[PDB]
Amino acid sequence: MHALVQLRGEVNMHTDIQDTLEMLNIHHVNHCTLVPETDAYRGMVAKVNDFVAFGEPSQETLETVLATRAEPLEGDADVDDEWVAEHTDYDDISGLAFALLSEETTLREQGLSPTLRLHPPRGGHDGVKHPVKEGGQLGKHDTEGIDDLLEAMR
Amino acid sequence: KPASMYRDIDKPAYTRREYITGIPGSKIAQHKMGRKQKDADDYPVQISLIVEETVQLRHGSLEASRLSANRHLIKELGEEGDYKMTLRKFPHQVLRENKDGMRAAFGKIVGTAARVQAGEQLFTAYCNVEDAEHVKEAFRRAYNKITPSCRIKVERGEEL
Amino acid sequence: ATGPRYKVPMRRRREARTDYHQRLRLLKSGKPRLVARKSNKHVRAQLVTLGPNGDDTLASAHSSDLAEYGWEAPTGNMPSAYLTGLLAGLRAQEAGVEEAVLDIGLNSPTPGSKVFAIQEGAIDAGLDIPHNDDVLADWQRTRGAHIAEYDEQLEEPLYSGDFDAADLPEHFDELRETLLDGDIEL
Amino acid sequence: FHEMREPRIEKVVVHMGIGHANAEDILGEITGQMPVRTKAKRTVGEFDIREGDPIGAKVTLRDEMAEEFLQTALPLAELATSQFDDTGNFSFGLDVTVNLVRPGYRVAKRDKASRSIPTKHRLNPADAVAFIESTYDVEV
Amino acid sequence: PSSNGPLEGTRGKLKNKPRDRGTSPPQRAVEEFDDGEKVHLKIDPSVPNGRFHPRFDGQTGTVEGKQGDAYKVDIVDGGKEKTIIVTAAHLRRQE
RNA sequence: UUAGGCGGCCACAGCGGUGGGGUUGCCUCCCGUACCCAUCCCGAACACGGAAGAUAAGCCCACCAGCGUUCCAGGGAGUACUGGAGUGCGCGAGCCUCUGGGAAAUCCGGUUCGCCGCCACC
RNA sequence: AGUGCAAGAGCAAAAGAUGACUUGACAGUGUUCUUCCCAACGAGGAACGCUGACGCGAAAGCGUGGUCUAGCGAACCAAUU
RNA sequence: CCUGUCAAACUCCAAACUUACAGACGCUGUUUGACGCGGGGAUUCCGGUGCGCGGGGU
Ligand SMILES: [Cl-]
Ligand SMILES: [Cl-]
Ligand SMILES: [Mg+2]
Ligand SMILES: [Mg+2]
Ligand SMILES: [Mg+2]
Ligand SMILES: [Mg+2]
Ligand SMILES: [Mg+2]
Ligand SMILES: [Mg+2]
Ligand SMILES: [Mg+2]
Ligand SMILES: [Mg+2]
Ligand code: NA
Ligand code: NA
Ligand code: NA
Ligand code: NA
Ligand code: NA
Ligand SMILES: [Sr+2]
Ligand SMILES: [Sr+2]
Ligand SMILES: [Sr+2]
Ligand SMILES: [Sr+2]
Ligand SMILES: [Sr+2]
Ligand SMILES: [Sr+2]
Ligand SMILES: [Sr+2]
């Protein structure tokens, strides 16, 4: 299970790539989606590789994120342990965060918007002109590297 | 004409003589020099001239370069000295010139050039350890009559 | 052989046993082929249908198993050929085969040939094969009458092993009548 | 073993390549069977503009007709060593050629399942001179 | 293109590789297909007649019937639907 | 299949070579032209009739890789080329980094001297 | 190699050669594609059917011209069945 | 034998890639009716630039 986060805008980006991002339920910059790790989903991220920032998040971080940025399918409501318990198949945020990572269910399956609408990275990101290996912020990340971003964009 | 007009590789490979006519003959006199009866392996030293950039060298440059390079070996080692130089490249690329404004602009055949990629051996000489300095000077004069910079790399010779 | 560009013929064309050009025109009918094949001492007749992995033989008849019902004469003549054809045609009726198209292979379409004699027999058996009556041999030559008249020019017996002196085209009649009979263990 | 390896005469072809015929008569007499015309291809500057047209004639003698013809033909010829083909064939002369081969040449001349004769079973110039010489004449 | 003929720019697709030269096997020239079947369209350079327009090489239509012995295969050129008359010689079963 | 017929794939099946196999069996070479049939001339072929002889041919069987071919391992090579991205370098032609793919020649060692279907048959 | 002629492509018990027979280069009506990729447009073109009449072959079958892609033309007027 | 080079109109080889069809996932549609079909109305047929691949031309 990977955390996809668009870092580069739509202007000038190829249509076949933009459509893929939209197929991955992410329509705006700074929007995050929790994508599994299958052959299919793999092709999609590879295509988006240069306009996104992905990686496997730590259970802890995924919890801090879900708690702060997750939303119902329709609604302004807060997704907290109590919320999770009442509508999901889990007992709290941690229970959910675990099943997702283990790829047992999906945010949509549990009545949650497939998109985690994050906030701009606090203290700025490492740059959208270079990948991670070159000191930039695009492409695949370390679990610790992905956490730094998500935590920064909580 | 200046080599500025033909030094770059920016056109299709134009070589098919079965479709091209009136191609000016190669100014290149000989490709094998020195003692073409003796072999390369019969020599302890093998120094080649290497082109650093990918270019197109006209037979006019090839001949001018090769000439002034071998002419030094003949001077410093004698007309029948103990050496053997080689020019491994041949002028295959036919050249045109639109010499009528831009209407019906496909030019007429003016010459031929040899296509060489960077890091290639334009020349390769084979000599003895003593005369290995007259070979380096031969190439020093040779790389001045061609468009790109070059490397005079010794391939066989720990005798330095 | 010589290299990459070389073109090696199809195995059965290489072996020179199958004419693919006639085979295609033959397969265009959609009917089973009545494969008529000969040999120096024998003559067989197969009923071949197409298939995924290769040809499919549903019925057949070798001149060898002709003696199985009473044949005591040789196995490479006109009476032999016709009688093999008729046997084959009967075994074919049994498997449900109702029509066929004569396939003679690399053999020549000569008037009165043993292949046409085979075709004549299979049709007599109750099969439907596109034929041409005047290309078939006359009834008596099919009986082997021309062979008996040859034995007439005796002085030295025609058959080494004793079958009889003047030969018997009547043996042909006996056996043909034996096959038309319903009983017979096909 | 040698029984199926001992050579025989396949055919004796007698021909008279003229060029524009009246010679058919003589061959018919000396051999003993009917002759056939000889045509040619490709235009020739030696008055041969008409492609397919009678230029000569030939006769292919087999069995008795061949041997009986050779009992009187061979003597008239002064045989030599360089007069042989690598397959054990010889032409001398009016031309007379003899095709010699081993007891199973039908395999290569038949229609069905024909195969070319193996080099080992192919006749040799040596076995040729021998066989011939062993029948009323001399070599070299 | 210099000319707008059927075989324009068909040098490659309508030519056999050296080892595939000569007359082709009759098995595929008489193969029986059923209505609704998926078939790949490829011209056999060896076989002259029963060909579809070269522009349709690489298609994978659906047999919807047959005219005579030749087949009628439905394909979709871009968005335009077309019925193609093509003999077994130039067809192969999908999967 | 102790030798057959019809095939599919259509060289992994080619080319070349070696050794073995046939009393009433089989395929043959083979013997022979009265007939059906045959050769623009030849029962050569084709067609028809038949067994004295043979296993030398063919064919069937076992095997050799020198040539050709199919495939596999390592080397070449993640090299050549390349789909996606870059306020990376270069006067420039052009190159480089990240990401996703990825040769060919050639070397070396192995493979391959067909496989499979149906029918008939000590 | 040859296959009438450009170029590219197809063909070897043939599509090439020889031979003999024959004149399907026939009458009529279509399906489809092409012409005009996608995507509307005429004449022309091709493949593929059907009805009738023929030629050949033992038969399967082949022949709607010359192996495939060039050799073509509206109404009006004119002649003709 | 050995030795030195080439091909837009060469190929014993051979990608990346583009592309037909089907399944899967994704997305989407069955009160926002998609896909498709029929009809009304257009405008438009001087384009330009960047990048990639080009062809011509110093
Ligand atoms: Cl046979
Ligand atoms: Cl079509
Ligand atoms: Mg909402
Ligand atoms: Mg700030
Ligand atoms: Mg910044
Ligand atoms: Mg091309
Ligand atoms: Mg032996
Ligand atoms: Mg710069
Ligand atoms: Mg007028
Ligand atoms: Mg008129
Ligand atoms: Na002008
Ligand atoms: Na073929
Ligand atoms: Na004549
Ligand atoms: Na033998
Ligand atoms: Na039309
Ligand atoms: Sr240019
Ligand atoms: Sr320079
Ligand atoms: Sr004989
Ligand atoms: Sr400059
Ligand atoms: Sr890989
Ligand atoms: Sr035609
Ligand atoms: Sr393209």
Radius of gyration from the alpha-carbon trace of chain D, in angstroms: 17 Å
| Second CATH tier, the architecture of the largest domain in chain A | 2-Layer Sandwich
Q: Can you tell me the number of structural domains of chain A?
A: 2
Described by strand count, sense and barrel closure, the largest sheet of chain D is: 5 strands, antiparallel
By DSSP, the count of extended strands of chain D is 5
Largest sheet, spatial ordering of strands of chain A: 4-2-1-3-5
Fill in the CATH topology of the largest domain in chain A: Ribosomal Protein L30, Chain: A
Shape estimate of chain D: globular
Query: Strand count, sense and closure of the main sheet of chain A?
Result: 5 strands, mixed
Sequence of strands across the biggest β-sheet of chain D: 2-3-1-5-4
The largest inter-chain interface, given as chain pair and residues per side, is: C-E, 14 and 10 residues
Oligomeric organization of the protein chains:
part of a larger assembly
Beta-strand content bin of chain A = 5-15%
Function (chain C): This is one of 5 proteins that mediate the attachment of the 5S rRNA onto the large ribosomal subunit, where it forms part of the central protuberance and stabilizes the orientation of adjacent RNA domains.
GO biological process, one term (chain C): translation
GO molecular function (chain C): 5S rRNA binding; structural constituent of ribosome
Family (chain C): Belongs to the universal ribosomal protein uL18 family.
Would you write up a description of this structure?
It is classed as ribosome. The entry lists the keywords G2482A mutation, ribosome. Structure of Anisomycin resistant 50S Ribosomal Subunit: 23S rRNA mutation G2482A. Chain A: 50S ribosomal protein L30P. This is part of a larger assembly, with chains A (154 residues), B (160 residues), C (186 residues), D (140 residues) and E (95 residues). Chain B is an alpha+beta fold and 160 residues long. Helix content of chain B is 19%, strand content 28%. Chain B contains 2 helices and 7 strands, in the order E-E-H-E-E-E-E-H-E. In chain C, strand 2 and strand 3 form a beta hairpin. The longest helix of chain D has 10 residues. The radius of gyration of chain D is 17 Å and the shape is globular. With 140 residues, chain D is α+β, with helices and mostly antiparallel strands. Chain D has a 5-stranded antiparallel sheet, covered by helices on one side. Chain D is built from 4 helices and 5 strands, in the order E-H-E-E-H-E-E-H-H. Helices cover 0% and strands 32% of the residues of chain E. In chain E, strand 3 and strand 4 form a beta hairpin. The radius of gyration of chain E is 14 Å and the shape is globular. The chains are: A alpha+beta (154), B alpha+beta (160), C alpha+beta (186), D alpha+beta (140), E mainly beta (95). The site of one magnesium ion has 3 residues of chain A, from loops. Chain C binds 3 RNA strands through helix 1, helix 2, strand 1, strand 2 and strand 3.
